[PDB]
Design an enzyme around this catalytic site. Sequence first.
Site, PDB file in Angstrom:
ATOM      1  N   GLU A 111       0.855  -1.213   0.000  1.00 25.53           N
ATOM      2  CA  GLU A 111       0.000   0.000   0.000  1.00 25.53           C
ATOM      3  C   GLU A 111       0.889   1.262   0.000  1.00 25.53           C
ATOM      4  CD  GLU A 120       4.490   8.759   1.166  1.00 22.97           C
ATOM      5  OE1 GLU A 120       3.787   9.686   1.601  1.00 22.97           O
ATOM      6  OE2 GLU A 120       5.637   8.518   1.589  1.00 22.97           O
TER       7      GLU A 120
HETATM    8  N1  LIG Z   1       9.898   0.102   1.326  1.00 19.68           N
HETATM    9  C1  LIG Z   1       9.375   0.133   2.566  1.00 19.68           C
HETATM   10  N2  LIG Z   1       9.684  -0.878   3.417  1.00 19.68           N
HETATM   11  C2  LIG Z   1       9.087  -0.916   4.610  1.00 19.68           C
HETATM   12  N3  LIG Z   1       8.174  -0.083   5.117  1.00 19.68           N
HETATM   13  C3  LIG Z   1       7.894   0.904   4.270  1.00 19.68           C
HETATM   14  C4  LIG Z   1       8.464   1.115   3.024  1.00 19.68           C
HETATM   15  N4  LIG Z   1       7.992   2.294   2.465  1.00 19.68           N
HETATM   16  C5  LIG Z   1       7.132   2.737   3.353  1.00 19.68           C
HETATM   17  N5  LIG Z   1       6.980   1.916   4.442  1.00 19.68           N
HETATM   18  C6  LIG Z   1       5.853   1.876   5.388  1.00 19.68           C
HETATM   19  O1  LIG Z   1       4.699   1.491   4.661  1.00 19.68           O
HETATM   20  C7  LIG Z   1       3.520   2.104   5.235  1.00 19.68           C
HETATM   21  C8  LIG Z   1       2.729   2.829   4.158  1.00 19.68           C
HETATM   22  S1  LIG Z   1       3.753   4.128   3.397  1.00 19.68           S
HETATM   23  C9  LIG Z   1       2.499   5.239   2.694  1.00 19.68           C
HETATM   24  C10 LIG Z   1       1.861   6.181   3.706  1.00 19.68           C
HETATM   25  C11 LIG Z   1       0.336   6.191   3.641  1.00 19.68           C
HETATM   26  C12 LIG Z   1      -0.227   6.540   2.264  1.00 19.68           C
HETATM   27  N6  LIG Z   1      -1.614   6.087   2.087  1.00 19.68           N
HETATM   28  C13 LIG Z   1      -2.579   7.197   2.030  1.00 19.68           C
HETATM   29  C14 LIG Z   1      -3.433   7.175   0.785  1.00 19.68           C
HETATM   30  C15 LIG Z   1      -3.800   8.356   0.144  1.00 19.68           C
HETATM   31  C16 LIG Z   1      -4.479   8.322  -1.066  1.00 19.68           C
HETATM   32  C17 LIG Z   1      -4.813   7.107  -1.645  1.00 19.68           C
HETATM   33  C18 LIG Z   1      -4.504   5.904  -1.002  1.00 19.68           C
HETATM   34  C19 LIG Z   1      -4.989   4.601  -1.530  1.00 19.68           C
HETATM   35  C20 LIG Z   1      -6.291   4.459  -2.018  1.00 19.68           C
HETATM   36  C21 LIG Z   1      -6.722   3.277  -2.597  1.00 19.68           C
HETATM   37  C22 LIG Z   1      -5.847   2.223  -2.695  1.00 19.68           C
HETATM   38 CL1  LIG Z   1      -6.394   0.710  -3.401  1.00 19.68          CL
HETATM   39  C23 LIG Z   1      -4.554   2.321  -2.216  1.00 19.68           C
HETATM   40  C24 LIG Z   1      -4.142   3.504  -1.622  1.00 19.68           C
HETATM   41  C25 LIG Z   1      -3.809   5.962   0.207  1.00 19.68           C
HETATM   42  C26 LIG Z   1       4.008   2.959   6.415  1.00 19.68           C
HETATM   43  O2  LIG Z   1       3.775   2.267   7.644  1.00 19.68           O
HETATM   44  C27 LIG Z   1       5.495   3.182   6.103  1.00 19.68           C
HETATM   45  O3  LIG Z   1       6.196   3.348   7.336  1.00 19.68           O
END
Ligand SMILES: Nc1ncnc2c1ncn2[C@@H]1O[C@H](CSCCCCNCc2cccc(-c3ccc(Cl)cc3)c2)[C@@H](O)[C@H]1O
Length: 617
Positions: A111, A120
């Site tokens: 996600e 992101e």
């Molecule tokens: N590469 C990484 N490895 C490990 N952890 C990692 C890595 N990148 C990041 N994080 C972690 O992932 C985790 C997530 S980040 C992203 C932050 C939140 C963004 N959503 C907000 C949002 C806004 C608008 C639309 C949508 C949306 C709508 C529909 C659908 Cl179907 C899918 C998405 C979502 C956090 O907990 C981070 O701390």
Amino acid sequence: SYADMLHDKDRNIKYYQGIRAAVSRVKDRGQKALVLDIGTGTGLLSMMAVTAGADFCYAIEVFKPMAEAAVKIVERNGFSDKIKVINKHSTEVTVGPDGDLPCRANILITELFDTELIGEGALPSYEHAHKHLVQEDCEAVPHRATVYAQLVESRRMWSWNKLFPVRVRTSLGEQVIVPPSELERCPGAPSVCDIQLNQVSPADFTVLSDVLPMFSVDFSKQVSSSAACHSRQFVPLASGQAQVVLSWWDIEMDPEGKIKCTMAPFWAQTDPQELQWRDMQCVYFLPQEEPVVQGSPRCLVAHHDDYCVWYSLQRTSPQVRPVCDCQAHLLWNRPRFGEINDQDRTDHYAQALRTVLLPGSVCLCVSDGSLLSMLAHHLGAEQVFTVESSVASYRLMKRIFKVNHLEDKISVINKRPELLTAADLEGKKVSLLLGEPFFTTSLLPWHNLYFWYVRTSVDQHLAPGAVVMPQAASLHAVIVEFRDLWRIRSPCGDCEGFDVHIMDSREAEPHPLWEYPCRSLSKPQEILTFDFQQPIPQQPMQSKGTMELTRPGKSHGAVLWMEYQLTPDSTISTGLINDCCWNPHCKQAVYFLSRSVSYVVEFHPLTGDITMEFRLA
Ligand SMILES: Nc1ncnc2c1ncn2[C@@H]1O[C@H](CSCCCCNCc2cccc(-c3ccc(Cl)cc3)c2)[C@@H](O)[C@H]1O
Ligand SMILES: [Zn+2]
């Protein structure tokens, strides 16, 4: 941030449908279903994958506190046997004997999407994952996303990106403040403007293109973080000035495209009544506006690197992300451009000045990147001093003065305004201290009371019978029912049968409520009044009180905002303008609660901080 992820039932239900279908595809080929969940947050999608029949899940979360919560949530729901939480960035994760994984996974769930889709780090995370962590020939949820663009003309949205001519009427006819030519030429700030396009009046912009599919990302195949550009030929639906590119994406959760979320605004979907609210869309600016002609085709080009998107119109003949070379875009955010480009607001400040400008008055102007100093001089001030507390801002203001031939009529003082000296005023006394007030670093409306602190600090430089403008200011509140925004801070507690309860004074939050429809339950009540004409009392201002809830609905929050009494005959609101109508240039503060609400509010003089509590009763 992760309070919004749970309240989004449409997102959760679609991930759940995708995960069920992707685990079944693997189990049906007689294979071990091994999940890699990059950005697990709570572990919800890993818990879904196990209920769907996955053999094991490797749930990656870089943020220790969330990792630690994910461990406890997985245990409470009974999934510790089949889910290992790994507290690392996915790019630090390895497969091997001393690795995090024993072997490559064959179901990839993430996600890692924002409004811009790729902001992101989805592109580099997916890239590293296909390279090191996942089998070739692997399911992915989501399976594919597509970014769409729509070319528009929009005086209002273009006023977030350009300084327009600013008009003032002097005794000797109407004067025009023109912008330095380098603003007109700048590509603008090299960052997305994320808005709820659903709250933009269809009158505020004219559609010039169809919704154009610009590019897709296939998450099931190797993904590149490399720079690329995608060109789409289109036929303009009308004639006008190409200015703004409105953007949004959709996701498909399955290879067949049966399971789909879209961020598309109302006018691009078939039924507005089927709309599902999100916590939105992108606004980009073309690096130059230019005419398009009905029937006469052009090529819109989406550019991207590993994190950023930006747009150009291919020349008729006929790449770093262009950067600000004009200074303005680095000092003025999009709302502030909009604020400065509001001629009615400038007019309202002009009329305030005509009032309090006694013959031969000596003006000190306090407010970051303000045009008041130029208005003051055009309206007959004897002399204008202005404060710009950064060199960047000093230089931009001198530049605007210069191109308007006022370089010798306005003195800029490059200091913190409170630290100002008698010599900075050339020994002259100030008959008129004035401001908006506005400061760049103000996040809450009352941060602009820094104006009042400055007025206090420079008392000794004020001429006797010195007028201040604003003369006074007031903190106002109103209790409201939100159409949607409550979900940003309303505990889910149960998420699709999974227990995330371990996830689910109080600081008021700033929000641009023009984008977040709500209705008033109380009447608007004045909470504190600030007399700028006098110094700051060095003892805290308290105010207990009651607000009677006179129309029904969930009392969701107290919306707070400033009003400024400019002159006795003149006031201006950063909150309600007359569903509540909100000044679209400022952020209002929301207190979330968690037939009457009661409050303790206290203003603290050494700081400008305001502590508050709102209890239903
Ligand atoms: N590469 C990484 N490895 C490990 N952890 C990692 C890595 N990148 C990041 N994080 C972690 O992932 C985790 C997530 S980040 C992203 C932050 C939140 C963004 N959503 C907000 C949002 C806004 C608008 C639309 C949508 C949306 C709508 C529909 C659908 Cl179907 C899918 C998405 C979502 C956090 O907990 C981070 O701390
Ligand atoms: Zn610029």
